């Protein structure tokens, strides 16, 4: 409707008498495009509330403003939504014109400065080039050429700095599909962890991102192993605010399945769709054996007992003692326990380096044993005050 | 004509008579050919002593490419008779960084296939501990991942 012309007129008139960037033929075209309230392009502060609609092919007219453009909003605001609205366009020719043809040293290093960035406020798109090359070629090339695109990127990340952490989101979004094309998801799980911490700032705080992120966190935590098993599911319950079923309900049963460890609960967990991956069969016994071990480690540690045996370990995992010795060693190399399991003695020696977070049940007795037992040293040291 | 034993003795002290310290480039082709004569003769310990004074001085000069790609090819053939897999991994070192800078991955990948294949043949090492994690061996052939 007329919301494009009316709102832009107020902000422009209070600054410029006549629109410097808008050509007098293009001024009427602002409200002439669509029938909706918000169109596919805008300027200055009005552009902040504007985003892409369907296929913003009219951005060429917005790029046509160069000379007098900076008299309204700074000249570096062109590339803000230029490549943001084309994210759903998926075109190779339109990407090369805004990346390779953009090059560097255009007008910005002559009469102005350069803040790099470019997707917020006003910044130059040189830093935007190296960030968007990996996304455009993500669905084009394969795992071979995908490594060379990360070399010019990761090295650029350490070469220059940016205040917003959103630049890692595009870095983690590329590695998300890069690790998805592979087999082992261990690297895919650690990638989504730092991606969630960067969701708090701007650049799409909407809940549409949590829908696709919950699907990544469900598969990453299933076949990945870093900290506990399900312990990271209750830290950020962003999945409870989105669709419950369609692969999102597997984490509902997985929460109470690992605490129990019954085979009947696993039938509702894995289905025919997820059972076509051979990696699932390997980590099916890795999740249950670890969560049953985490309980035994908390159980074995009371006061003086650092040592387990082959009884409670094999009965909980329902596995023969011959394999269990070598199956824990796969989790031993992860930094859990440094102990050395014996054979003839049938006793598990445990050197426990594991942090084991989520405290507060122990701290009642744990913290008091660092005072009352330490007070025994203070009482016995009062007889040393002679000199 | 079938003459072998008398071939290595001709090029031994003759290269020193021309340029001793002067021109190494003309001396390169003589040491390489004489070391090949010891391989056909069947004596691996002969060609080892023949190359001494040249040392690493080529590495202290700008990279001439195919030069460094020759010596390390004939040094593995010397270790082939000895069947020592520890020295072969050291001769594959400088060429590993040569094809990763100057040349492309066309000839770089198939050489790496035998570089990590020989690392399992030695009880690790001080240098091999840094040879564990590599950035460029995580792609292309899956057996390169299997060896990794």
With both helix axes pointing from N to C terminus, report the angle between A321-332 and A310-317 in degrees, rounded to the nearest 10: 90
Which phi-psi region, left, alpha or beta, contains residue A42 (left: φ > 0; alpha: ψ -120 to 50)?
A: beta
In 10 A of CB B24, how many CB atoms? Answer: 15
Domain-embedded: residue A59: yes
Contact A75, A93 (CB under 8 A): no
Residue of B nearest to A143 (CA): B139
* Alpha-carbon separation of residue A146 from A40, A141, A173 (angstroms): 32, 7, 13
Alpha-carbon dihedral of residues B67, B73, B77, B78, nearest 10 degrees?
A: 40
Q: Which residue in chain A is spatially nearest to B135 when comparing CA positions?
A: A147
The secondary structure of residue A307, as a DSSP letter, is -
> Cβ of B141 under 8 Å from any chain A Cβ?
no
Determine contact, residues A53/A105, Cβ cutoff 8 Å.
no
Chain A nearest CA to B139, separation (Å): 6
DSSP B6-26: HHHTTTTTHHHHH-SSS-SHH
Phi, psi at A5, each rounded to 5°:
-75, -40
Q: Give the separation between CA B91 and CA B76, rounded to whole angstroms.
A: 7
Residue A189's nearest CA partner among A211, A221, A214 is: A221
Cα separation values, A79 from A89, A113, A202, A301, B82, Å: 16, 16, 17, 59, 64
Q: What is the dihedral of CA A213, A216, A218, A223, to 10 degrees?
A: -160
* Distance (Å) of CA B94 to CA A37, B73, B77, B104, B120: 65, 12, 17, 15, 19
Distance from CA of A169 to the nearest CA of B (A): 22
Q: A182: Cβ–Cβ under 8 A, 6 or more apart, which residues?
A: A143, A188
Q: How far is CA A188 from CA A45, A169, A335, B88, B108, in A?
A: 38, 13, 19, 37, 28
Residue A84 domain flag: yes
Q: A100: which 2 tokens?
A: 């390779």
Testing the interface with B: which of A147, A155, A184 to mutate, by most B Cβ within 10 A?
A147
Measured distance CA(B28)–CA(B24) in Å, rounded: 6
Find residues 50-79 of chain A whose CB sits inside 8 Å of chain B: none
Q: Please report where in the chains the tokens 């001494």 appear, as a residue.
A: B52
Residue numbers in A near B136 (CB within 8 A): 147
Method used to obtain the model: cryo-EM
Backbone angles phi, psi at A67, to 5 degrees: -55, -65
Burial class (CB in 10 A: 0-12, 13-18, 19+), A162: middle
Q: How far is B140 from chain A (nearest CA, A)?
A: 6
Which of A:124-183 have CB within 8 Å of B? 143-144, 146-147
Q: For residue A269, is it within any domain? A: yes
Query: Which pairs from A245-249 meet CB under 8 Å and 24+ separation?
Result: A247/A215, A247/A218, A248/A214, A248/A215, A248/A218
3-state secondary structure of A347: strand
Inter-chain Cβ pairs, chain A and chain B, closer than 8 A: 8
Collect all residues of chain B within an 8 Å Cβ-Cβ radius of residue A144. Answer: 139-140
The CA distance from B13 to A55, in Å, is: 79
Give, as one character, the DSSP assignment of residue A348: E
Closest-CA distance, B127 to chain A, in angstroms, reads 22
Tokens of B57: 């001085």
Give chain A positions within 8 Å (CB) of B140. 144
Asked whether the beta carbons of A77 and A122 are under 8 A apart, the reply is yes
What's the token pair of residue A102?
């953009």
Check residue A319 and give left, alpha or beta (phi > 0: left; psi -120 to 50: alpha): beta
Q: Which two tokens stand for residue B97?
A: 């960084």
Strand-pair partners of A352: A337
The pair of structure tokens assigned to A339 is 């102990």
The secondary structure element, H or E, covering residue A308 is strand A308-309
The structure tokens 């939504």 sit at: A81
Q: How many CB atoms lie within 10 A of CB A160?
A: 12
Residues of B in contact with A143 (CB under 8 A): 139
A95 Cβ contact list (under 8 Å, min separation 6): A86, A132, A136
- Which of chain B's residues have a Cβ under 8 Å away from the Cβ of A147? 135-136, 138-139
- DSSP per-residue string spanning A10-40: HHHHTT-SS-SSS-HHHHHHTTTS-SSSS-S
A146 chain-B contacts, CB cut-off 8 A = 139
Q: Which H or E run contains A322?
A: helix A321-332
Residue A216 lies in a domain: yes
Hey, is the C-beta of A333 within 8 angstroms of any chain B C-beta? no
Tokens encoding A211: 């829908």
Inter-residue long-range contacts of A301-305, CB under 8 Å, 24+ positions, other chains counted:
A301/A352
Is A22 within a domain?
A: yes
Query: A147: buried, middle or exposed (CB in 10 Å: 19+, 13-18, 0-12)?
Result: middle
CA-nearest residue to A151 within chain B is B135
| Domain-located, residue A1 | no
C-beta atoms of B136 and A147 within 8 A: yes
A135 in a domain, yes or no? yes
Q: How many Å apart are CA B60 and CA B62, to the nearest integer?
A: 7
Residues of A in contact with B139 (CB under 8 A): 143-144, 146-147
CA distance A147 to chain B (A): 8
Number of domains in chain A: 1
* Deposited resolution, Å: 6.3
Phi/psi region, residue B141 (left: phi>0; alpha: psi -120 to 50; beta: rest), is beta
Q: Closest-CA residue in chain A for B105?
A: A144
Contacts (Cβ under 8 Å, ≥6 apart) of A21: A43, A65, A68, A69, A71, A72
Q: How far is A320 from chain B (nearest CA, A)?
A: 28
Say whether residue B93 is in contact with chain A using an 8 A CB cutoff.
Answer: no
Residues 117-136 (B) with a CB less than 8 A from some CB of A: 135-136
Q: Residue A164 in contact with residue A120, Cβ under 8 Å?
A: yes
Looking at beta carbons, which residues of chain B come within 8 Å of A148?
A: none
> Which residues of chain A are within 8 Å of residue B142 when distances are taken between CB atoms?
none
**Among B61, B57, B32, which Cα is nearest to B47's?**
B32
Helix (H) or strand (E) holding A309, with range, is strand A308-309
Q: What is the DSSP string of B34-93?
A: HHHHHHHHT-HHHHHHHS-TTTTTTTTS---STTHHHHHHHHHHHHHHHT-HHHHHHHTH
How far is it, in rounded angstroms, from Cα A372 to Cα A246? 54
**Residue B132 φ/ψ, nearest 5 degrees:** -75, -65
Q: Range of A338's domain?
A: 6-387
């Amino acid at each position: 409707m007329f919301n494009n012309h009316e709102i832009d007129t107020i902000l422009s008139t209070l600054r410029m008498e006549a629109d410097p960037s808008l050509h007098p033929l293009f001024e009427q075209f602002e409200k002439f495009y669509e029938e909706k309230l918000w169109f596919q392009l805008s300027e200055s502060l009005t552009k902040f509330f504007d985003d892409a609609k369907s296929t913003p092919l009219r951005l060429r007219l917005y790029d046509n403003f160069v000379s007098k453009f900076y008299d309204k909003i700074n000249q570096l605001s062109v590339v803000k939504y230029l490549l943001a609205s084309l994210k759903d366009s998926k075109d190779f020719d339109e990407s090369l014109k805004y990346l390779d043809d953009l090059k560097a040293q255009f007008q910005e290093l002559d009469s102005k400065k350069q803040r790099n960035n470019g997707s917020k406020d006003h910044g130059d798109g040189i830093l935007l080039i190296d960030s968007e090359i990996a996304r455009t070629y993500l669905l084009k090339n394969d795992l071979v050429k995908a490594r060379d695109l990360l070399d010019d990127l990761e090295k650029t990340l350490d070469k220059k700095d940016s205040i917003p952490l959103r630049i890692t989101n595009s870095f983690y979004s590329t590695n998300s599909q890069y690790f998805k094309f592979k087999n082992d998801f261990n690297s895919f799980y650690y990638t989504s962890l730092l991606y969630l911490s960067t969701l708090e700032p701007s650049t799409s705080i909407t809940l549409a991102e949590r829908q696709q992120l919950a699907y990544d966190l469900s598969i990453s935590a299933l076949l990945g192993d870093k900290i506990y098993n399900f312990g990271e599911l209750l830290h950020h319950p962003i999945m409870e605010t989105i669709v419950n079923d369609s692969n999102y309900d597997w984490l509902f049963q997985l929460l109470n399945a690992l605490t129990v460890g019954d085979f009947d609960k696993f039938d509702s967990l894995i289905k025919v769709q997820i059972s076509k991956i051979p990696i699932l069969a390997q980590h099916e016994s890795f999740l249950r054996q670890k969560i049953c071990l985490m309980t035994l480690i908390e159980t074995v540690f009371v006061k003086n007992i650092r040592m387990l045996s082959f009884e409670d370990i094999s009965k909980a995992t329902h596995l023969p003692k011959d394999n269990v010795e070598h199956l824990v060693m796969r989790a031993i190399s992860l930094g859990l326990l440094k102990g050395s399991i014996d054979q003839v003695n049938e006793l598990v020696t445990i050197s426990w380096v594991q942090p084991r977070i989520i405290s507060g049940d122990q701290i009642t007795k744990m913290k008091d044993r660092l005072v009352e037992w330490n007070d025994q040293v203070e009482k016995l040291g009062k007889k040393m005050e002679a000199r | 004509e079938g003459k072998i034993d008398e071939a290595a003795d001709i090029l031994c002290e003759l290269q020193v008579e021309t340029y001793g310290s002067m021109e190494m480039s003309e001396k390169i082709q003589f040491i390489l050919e004489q070391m090949e004569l010891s391989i056909l003769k069947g004596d691996y310990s002969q060609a080892t002593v023949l190359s001494r004074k040249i040392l690493k001085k080529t590495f202290k000069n700008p990279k001439y490419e195919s030069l460094k790609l020759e010596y390390y090819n004939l040094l593995v053939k010397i270790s082939l008779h000895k069947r020592e897999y520890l020295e072969v991994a050291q001769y594959l070192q400088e060429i590993y960084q040569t094809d990763a800078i100057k040349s492309d991955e066309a000839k770089w990948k198939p050489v790496l296939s035998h570089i990590v294949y020989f690392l399992v043949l030695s009880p690790y090492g001080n240098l091999q501990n840094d040879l564990i994690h590599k950035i460029q061996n995580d792609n292309n052939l899956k057996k390169l991942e299997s060896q990794e």
